[PDB]
Write an enzyme that holds these catalytic residues in place. Sequence first.
Site, short mmCIF file in Angstrom:
data_model
loop_
_atom_site.label_atom_id
_atom_site.label_comp_id
_atom_site.label_asym_id
_atom_site.label_seq_id
_atom_site.Cartn_x
_atom_site.Cartn_y
_atom_site.Cartn_z
N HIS A 192 42.21 -23.70 6.21
CA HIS A 192 42.80 -24.80 5.70
C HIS A 192 43.94 -24.99 6.37
O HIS A 192 44.35 -26.00 7.38
CB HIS A 192 42.82 -25.05 4.14
CG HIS A 192 43.77 -26.26 3.91
ND1 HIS A 192 43.66 -27.41 4.47
CD2 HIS A 192 44.98 -26.33 3.03
CE1 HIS A 192 44.71 -28.24 3.94
NE2 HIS A 192 45.39 -27.61 3.04
N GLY A 245 23.50 -52.36 -12.22
CA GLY A 245 23.83 -53.64 -11.90
C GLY A 245 22.84 -54.76 -11.76
O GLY A 245 21.84 -54.09 -12.12
N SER A 246 22.95 -55.91 -11.35
CA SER A 246 22.04 -56.86 -11.61
C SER A 246 21.05 -56.71 -10.27
O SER A 246 19.62 -56.79 -10.71
CB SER A 246 22.54 -58.26 -11.27
OG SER A 246 23.06 -58.45 -10.14
N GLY A 257 37.56 -30.79 -1.14
CA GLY A 257 38.82 -31.15 -1.64
C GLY A 257 38.91 -32.26 -2.17
O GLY A 257 40.23 -32.87 -2.53
N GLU A 271 19.86 -53.80 -9.62
CA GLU A 271 19.03 -52.69 -10.21
C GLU A 271 18.36 -52.94 -11.42
O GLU A 271 17.32 -51.98 -11.72
CB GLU A 271 19.96 -51.63 -10.42
CG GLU A 271 20.86 -51.00 -9.12
CD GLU A 271 21.91 -52.03 -8.76
OE1 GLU A 271 22.37 -52.91 -9.61
OE2 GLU A 271 21.84 -52.15 -7.33
N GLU A 312 31.45 -44.99 -10.46
CA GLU A 312 30.55 -44.46 -9.79
C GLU A 312 31.06 -43.29 -9.08
O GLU A 312 30.03 -42.40 -9.20
CB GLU A 312 30.13 -45.37 -8.52
CG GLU A 312 29.35 -46.65 -9.13
CD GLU A 312 30.17 -47.69 -9.61
OE1 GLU A 312 31.31 -47.76 -9.53
OE2 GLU A 312 29.54 -48.74 -10.05
N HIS A 316 25.09 -49.56 -7.94
CA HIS A 316 25.05 -50.99 -7.75
C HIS A 316 25.57 -51.36 -6.31
O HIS A 316 26.88 -51.51 -6.09
CB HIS A 316 25.70 -51.81 -8.80
CG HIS A 316 25.82 -53.34 -8.37
ND1 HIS A 316 24.72 -54.05 -8.41
CD2 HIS A 316 26.75 -54.01 -8.27
CE1 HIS A 316 24.94 -55.41 -8.23
NE2 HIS A 316 26.11 -55.34 -7.95
C1 LIG Z 1 31.71 -51.43 -8.93
C2 LIG Z 1 30.67 -52.06 -9.88
N1 LIG Z 1 29.57 -51.62 -10.56
C3 LIG Z 1 28.87 -52.14 -11.29
C4 LIG Z 1 28.67 -53.54 -11.21
C5 LIG Z 1 27.41 -54.11 -11.84
N2 LIG Z 1 27.96 -55.27 -13.09
C6 LIG Z 1 28.00 -56.45 -12.70
C7 LIG Z 1 27.05 -57.32 -11.71
O1 LIG Z 1 26.19 -56.63 -10.87
C8 LIG Z 1 26.89 -58.61 -11.46
C9 LIG Z 1 28.01 -59.52 -11.07
C10 LIG Z 1 28.05 -60.74 -10.81
C11 LIG Z 1 27.25 -61.51 -10.03
C12 LIG Z 1 27.43 -62.72 -10.00
C13 LIG Z 1 28.41 -63.57 -10.79
N3 LIG Z 1 29.43 -62.67 -11.22
C14 LIG Z 1 29.09 -61.50 -11.55
S1 LIG Z 1 28.56 -57.41 -14.02
C15 LIG Z 1 28.77 -55.89 -14.89
C16 LIG Z 1 29.19 -56.00 -16.56
C17 LIG Z 1 30.71 -56.03 -16.65
O2 LIG Z 1 31.07 -56.05 -18.18
P1 LIG Z 1 32.35 -56.58 -18.61
O3 LIG Z 1 33.60 -56.35 -17.86
O4 LIG Z 1 32.44 -55.92 -20.21
O5 LIG Z 1 32.34 -58.12 -18.83
P2 LIG Z 1 30.93 -59.24 -19.59
O6 LIG Z 1 30.89 -58.15 -20.84
O7 LIG Z 1 31.48 -60.39 -19.71
O8 LIG Z 1 29.82 -59.24 -18.53
C18 LIG Z 1 28.15 -55.03 -14.24
C19 LIG Z 1 28.37 -53.24 -14.88
C20 LIG Z 1 29.48 -54.21 -10.46
N4 LIG Z 1 29.50 -55.54 -10.05
N5 LIG Z 1 30.52 -53.44 -9.78
C1 LIG Z 2 40.84 -38.08 -3.74
C2 LIG Z 2 42.20 -37.24 -3.23
N1 LIG Z 2 43.21 -37.95 -3.34
C3 LIG Z 2 44.34 -37.05 -2.82
C4 LIG Z 2 44.30 -35.97 -2.54
C5 LIG Z 2 45.71 -35.00 -2.26
N2 LIG Z 2 46.06 -33.88 -3.00
C6 LIG Z 2 45.69 -32.60 -2.73
C7 LIG Z 2 45.50 -32.21 -1.30
O1 LIG Z 2 45.66 -33.11 -0.19
C8 LIG Z 2 45.13 -30.54 -0.92
C9 LIG Z 2 44.05 -30.10 -1.27
C10 LIG Z 2 43.87 -28.69 -1.06
C11 LIG Z 2 43.82 -28.24 0.08
C12 LIG Z 2 43.61 -26.98 0.30
C13 LIG Z 2 43.53 -25.84 -0.83
N3 LIG Z 2 43.41 -26.58 -1.89
C14 LIG Z 2 43.62 -27.91 -2.35
S1 LIG Z 2 46.22 -31.61 -3.94
C15 LIG Z 2 46.83 -33.04 -5.04
C16 LIG Z 2 47.79 -32.83 -6.09
C17 LIG Z 2 46.82 -32.44 -7.32
O2 LIG Z 2 47.67 -32.33 -8.59
P1 LIG Z 2 47.36 -31.51 -9.85
O3 LIG Z 2 45.88 -31.83 -10.08
O4 LIG Z 2 48.55 -32.06 -10.79
O5 LIG Z 2 47.49 -30.28 -9.60
P2 LIG Z 2 48.73 -29.15 -9.03
O6 LIG Z 2 50.01 -29.64 -9.63
O7 LIG Z 2 48.36 -27.83 -9.69
O8 LIG Z 2 48.93 -29.07 -7.76
C18 LIG Z 2 46.55 -34.09 -4.12
C19 LIG Z 2 47.12 -35.67 -4.49
C20 LIG Z 2 43.03 -35.09 -2.51
N4 LIG Z 2 42.97 -33.99 -2.36
N5 LIG Z 2 41.69 -35.79 -2.92
#
Ligand SMILES: Cc1ncc(C[n+]2c([C@@H](O)/C=C/c3cccnc3)sc(CCOP(=O)(O)OP(=O)(O)O)c2C)c(N)n1
Ligand SMILES: Cc1ncc(C[n+]2c([C@@H](O)/C=C/c3cccnc3)sc(CCOP(=O)(O)OP(=O)(O)O)c2C)c(N)n1
EC number: 4.1.1.7
Lengths: 525, 525, 525
Positions: free
Chosen positions: B280, B24-25, B400, B27, B46, B69
């Site tokens: 769990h 990002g900018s 988890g 960085e 990320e 970023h």
């Molecule tokens: C979650 C996240 N991760 C990283 C960034 C860093 N970043 C961004 C920034 O750090 C800068 C943001 C900014 C700052 C001022 C005004 N407008 C935007 S821009 C960017 C590239 C996006 O590429 P794309 O969608 O292909 O469009 P363009 O080709 O037209 O530029 C990145 C990677 C970010 N802003 N957010």
């Molecule tokens: C970031 C995030 N978001 C939501 C959840 C909730 N969650 C999970 C939980 O809340 C439970 C986690 C758990 C708890 C104990 C032991 N092992 C796993 S499991 C799950 C479904 C994943 O489906 P899939 O990958 O298709 O595999 P299966 O069909 O074999 O189950 C979800 C949605 C999670 N664990 N993490």
Amino acid sequence: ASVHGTTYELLRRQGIDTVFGNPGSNELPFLKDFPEDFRYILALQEACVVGIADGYAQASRKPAFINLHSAAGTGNAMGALSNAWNSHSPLIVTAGQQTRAMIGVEALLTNVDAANLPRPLVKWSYEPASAAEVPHAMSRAIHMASMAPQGPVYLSVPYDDWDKDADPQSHHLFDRHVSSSVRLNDQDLDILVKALNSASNPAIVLGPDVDAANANADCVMLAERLKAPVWVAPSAPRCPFPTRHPCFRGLMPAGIAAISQLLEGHDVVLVIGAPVFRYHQYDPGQYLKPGTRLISVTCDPLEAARAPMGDAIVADIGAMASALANLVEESSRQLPTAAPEPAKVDQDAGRLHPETVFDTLNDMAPENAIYLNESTSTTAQMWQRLNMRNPGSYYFCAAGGLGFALPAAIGVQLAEPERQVIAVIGDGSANYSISALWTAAQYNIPTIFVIMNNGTYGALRWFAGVLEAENVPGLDVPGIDFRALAKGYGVQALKADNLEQLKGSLQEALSAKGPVLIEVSTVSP
Amino acid sequence: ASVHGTTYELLRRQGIDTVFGNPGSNELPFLKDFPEDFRYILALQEACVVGIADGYAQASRKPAFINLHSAAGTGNAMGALSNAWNSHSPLIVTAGQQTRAMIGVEALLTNVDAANLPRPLVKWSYEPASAAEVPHAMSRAIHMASMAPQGPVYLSVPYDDWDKDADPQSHHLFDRHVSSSVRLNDQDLDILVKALNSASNPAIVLGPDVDAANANADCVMLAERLKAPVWVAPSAPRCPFPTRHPCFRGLMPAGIAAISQLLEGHDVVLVIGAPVFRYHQYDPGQYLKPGTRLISVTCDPLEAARAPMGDAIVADIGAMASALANLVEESSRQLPTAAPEPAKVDQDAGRLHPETVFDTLNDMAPENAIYLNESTSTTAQMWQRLNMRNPGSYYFCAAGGLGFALPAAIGVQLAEPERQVIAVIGDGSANYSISALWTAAQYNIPTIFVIMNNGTYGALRWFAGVLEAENVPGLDVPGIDFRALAKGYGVQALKADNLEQLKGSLQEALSAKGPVLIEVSTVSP
Amino acid sequence: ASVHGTTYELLRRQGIDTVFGNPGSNELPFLKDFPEDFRYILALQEACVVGIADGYAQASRKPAFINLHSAAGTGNAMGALSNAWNSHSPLIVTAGQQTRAMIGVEALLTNVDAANLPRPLVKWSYEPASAAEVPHAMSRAIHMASMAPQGPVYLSVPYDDWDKDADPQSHHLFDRHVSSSVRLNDQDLDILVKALNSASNPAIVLGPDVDAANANADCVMLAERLKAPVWVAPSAPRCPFPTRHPCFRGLMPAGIAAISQLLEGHDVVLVIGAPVFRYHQYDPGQYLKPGTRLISVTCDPLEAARAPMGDAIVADIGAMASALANLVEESSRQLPTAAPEPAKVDQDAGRLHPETVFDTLNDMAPENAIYLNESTSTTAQMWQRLNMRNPGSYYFCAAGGLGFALPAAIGVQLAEPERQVIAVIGDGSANYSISALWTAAQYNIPTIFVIMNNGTYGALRWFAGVLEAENVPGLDVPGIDFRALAKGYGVQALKADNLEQLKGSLQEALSAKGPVLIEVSTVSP
Ligand SMILES: Cc1ncc(C[n+]2c([C@@H](O)/C=C/c3cccnc3)sc(CCOP(=O)(O)OP(=O)(O)O)c2C)c(N)n1
Ligand SMILES: Cc1ncc(C[n+]2c([C@@H](O)/C=C/c3cccnc3)sc(CCOP(=O)(O)OP(=O)(O)O)c2C)c(N)n1
Ligand SMILES: Cc1ncc(C[n+]2c([C@@H](O)/C=C/c3cccnc3)sc(CCOP(=O)(O)OP(=O)(O)O)c2C)c(N)n1
Ligand SMILES: [Mg+2]
Ligand SMILES: [Mg+2]
Ligand SMILES: [Mg+2]
């Protein structure tokens, strides 16, 4: 069993038998039916409750238990916690919260966002999600305070929790033994021992975790085998070494350039039980000179991470000092020669020089006295002039927070009933926790308080001189009668305006059967 | 030297040569003039950057360096940090902040209260008070991530700091060695060894810090000498023991009553490198039955404090496992007998049973394969059916948090170029960090992704059954074409709708020169 | 009544009828028996759940309710929260916690120190101390999110709480009306009105809280009466004014010196509904030139406090804009003249210039279209080229966090079923929340996604140019097939490699009955 009964059982099974407290209404349900085998030590303000507990913990080398009132009681104690953090003091701080049914509406005496209140000055801070959880949370608090690196912890408990039924499975908490008594693996220990054996001009630097560990005698053996000079790390909160041993070289100046200069020509400097380093004044220069390398043994990963130089080993100070003292070779170099005695400063028949006060204390106090310092402009002289042969003989507010020594001296004297505690406290510092005097009177804890009265915040006048800062307000503290404050709180009081009266006052205080305050008229800076 | 030059020098001197990032900018000033000896691994979101770094760290057993970023980049990674916290992964997370001159007005891309953003999921979190401080802060981050208990840390750096002059005294940071390789002192170790020698029916329970320490082979020696069954602690994020060794007894059920029942009749249970325990499901009962006592060795004071039962020792897992394996007596009891092979589940010519998929993977994969699990409803079967002889052979999201295995499999394969990585990921989990696939394609990191497609969040349907919960929305995930998503990101894709096609797809994927995704049609629960 | 029943009753009584979620096991007890009058909108990853809810809230001008899974689900959403914080979006984020009986041992899926996890990106963050408290805590969350300045809030609920008995007194929560619809007292309002009436060359600057308040038409009346030019404050997340109105002057450059230069000669600058100011680039100079004074009306005390210049009034934007528009005099100055139309950029038969894409969108889209921008290098052109006559017609990630527009476009289209939403998203940005596409497919929410494909992070190449930064890694994102990703998630996909195909693809997409993605081959920077 109730949560109340299970919690007191956990406490006694873990060695805790004293509650240092200032009570409040959220805590009455905890304090009722107070067990006959525990003892409650009241103090009149929370900085004093925590300072007393802190001295007691540090001198006893075990955790102390505190009970305070919700947020305002905990907040009144936060300066004291700042010290306890820097001294690694094992303090279990509990505070009462509102009944769970009243927390949402934020009734009066609710501790809002309670677990965040004491941060960043605690290792662990928590409020349980149910009453049945309270004994497990208390267990966690006991062990977090007690594991290396030791330090303060905080538990907030809704007052309705105590009368609820405990979980019968809480009995498994009662006899848990948790150790952090660890040392560097054999292979790496052998590398370290060989480096020490091979050093041509080793130096040792010791900090407060050595005294906390009672590793002092091992560090004497170590310095004798290595034939090495021993310094105390700067900003010292405890004394880790006999100050008239031939190896002893005194307190290091708390500056970067001063310390590298001091260490120049030493090829290996071994630091044990201290941060690297607790500098204070601005004194830019080299951290170490060419030819000096440093090796630190610390019980605290935060110390190891932040050292700007050297290698480090994170381990128990007692286990490491003992292993090194017994493994190193006896060097064929000559043992260091003892520093000479300090000179007598010229003293007329008037106000006392601080040098004269320490010289007289050293002449008259028992050889097992314990001293506390909160006389900020006289530290260097105190260190030069008091022969402290034994461990646990010195305490100075580890974060620089005034208001520690007066209450902590009472806790130390409670911990060590057979060692005379003598607190030397400036007239400025004496005010921060003045009400602690009442605890010494009420419980008859025979601490001697020596108030160095020069009418000013002397160290601040000194720092102002170093800064060349003119027109600074608020540096003078005239018009305090310490004999009247001691009378206020029930403590016998004496005044010494010259050396004859200092001697007589010390003789009377040393003979007394209770606490005594002596107000000493010292020379103005 | 500039802060940029001194910081990259510190990193390379401390063993770091790869930056996992999404730029990002704030960085760009850090990333410009990127050193020729470092390698930047781009990921498109990320959570994927941190998941890749995490697998790399865990498999390499060394810290990984991340650059994100500001606030939004760091926030996108916080679920990934939740896993890294529970796996003790040594992750150094850096994020760019606004120029110091723009922070006050809160210009766009300012990370407000930056050090609080990643808490409570980091060991240490900081923003330096000046540019010259940045190399020391980076040093602190490296060591905090790397000391036991290892874990993620966070450093925020204003983008104008990099071009400022570094402090010449920063060179003392470059070669610092900091050890936490410590074990219990000899006297207490001898007491522990005698208790193990004297046990009539000992059990061993191993957790992920054993694999992190590469202490697996020492724990095999230990279990062979003690003639003791070995379980893996519940909710296992890593595999600490060969799963076809005669002592191996499998993954413990993550419930209180299940575990005390399992351990009944064992007089001493020794837990190494795990929390006690990562339960769990709700499964109330006794923590331990009468006649069983527990002793835990953990590298983490927070684990030691919160165990509801047992004694504990806080020390390095590698040092402790090695010492115990070499000190205990060879018991005269008979060595445990190996668990029998799992049975073949009946399989018709249609959709695959998960049992069949694992059985076939086990038949076809190299003996040094590394597996990752994010197929939440099939864990027990995976553990029964994959022979994992070597260390570093299994990873499952330690908190988890779904979205770990797909990116982490790429990091693991980067760390272990000669071991085939096979990630078995459910159709639900596969979406959380789907964009990570692009990194494998771009860098040609030849991970195999096996997507278990049953159309639903199967484990949630199971938990709903246990709760007897009806009318729960959002459990089905129809209508995802994984072959099209792999094509989207440049990865070769195959489909297996039956066993014949599963075999052929695995043969082709195992022969491929780049990453491959196989979408497997699995039986609906 | 149970806590479950009372909480859903509170939600419906407060106007909430939709849950945006990704479910987990700590949330099943909340989601079971899901009420027939509510609607659950599933998304496959939490940044997408929160981005959808965010667009829905912003476009509907009412709070949106979110349900996520413990810590890892909440952490996956923190980048999205960073945006929601800067846009003042009223988001009620709930996350499931472990059963209260399992929190102490830190069972798997425990959200440790839960209330601190989302900070500093929420107005209020809390976990209740008992089950009966949950409806009151939910009430607090609803009102904290909804009061000016609106913003996200966080409530963590142990999963066992839902089936407990509710407090019968919770009914008093159901119909509470809480207003922050306030404006400056009459006397001070009259002073402000007289200053505006008396200005010889007033300027108006409008920010996103104007569109949030639907105060746009009042600000047109205000600018018409004052005969004043109207700018949009820099870093604009919303469009507060018709962009072809004669007073409109466009988006301000986000730099200090640029803005003071722009405002020079204007004697009074009135800012409504914006921070003062959301600068971005480093552009040092005067905050305001001699002769210009500034007056800000903001709904946010943090904005008022941190403005480096000007007076400020903290009040509701709708109430203030309406009062000022109706109280000021009609100036006798000539109405500003409309900016001229932008020129056509030369376009050959190959890759598209961004100018051409916006010009064509403007030619073909309905006059009530709503646009979202996450094409970071094309913003200035977008603002010049799209005639946006109506409120709620533009959204751009308010904290700069990519991954907002793709999900938020789906939420906006859900909020405004009769207004065509068109999201213009760069090929880089499109990856951060790519899985959101599945929600549009599954619910048939007919958003059009226009992916600007130039193969690179174009804005970062531009910032690198301004910094003169060479050898920056990670700026290119080749090898993504967006038509294949759309197919992956069930969305119709089209490609436009030149203008003829752009026109045809837009005609087909505008005619479609469901969501459509168009991958547009744009010119490389
Ligand atoms: C979650 C996240 N991760 C990283 C960034 C860093 N970043 C961004 C920034 O750090 C800068 C943001 C900014 C700052 C001022 C005004 N407008 C935007 S821009 C960017 C590239 C996006 O590429 P794309 O969608 O292909 O469009 P363009 O080709 O037209 O530029 C990145 C990677 C970010 N802003 N957010
Ligand atoms: C970031 C995030 N978001 C939501 C959840 C909730 N969650 C999970 C939980 O809340 C439970 C986690 C758990 C708890 C104990 C032991 N092992 C796993 S499991 C799950 C479904 C994943 O489906 P899939 O990958 O298709 O595999 P299966 O069909 O074999 O189950 C979800 C949605 C999670 N664990 N993490
Ligand atoms: C809680 C608190 N409040 C304020 C201070 C500031 N301060 C202190 C400091 O900011 C400096 C602390 C310090 C720093 C380095 C080494 N030693 C001490 S010293 C002080 C005056 C105490 O006066 P007194 O007890 O009469 O002794 P001297 O006359 O011998 O100096 C003050 C006021 C402080 N340290 N702690
Ligand atoms: Mg004084
Ligand atoms: Mg599935
Ligand atoms: Mg691009």
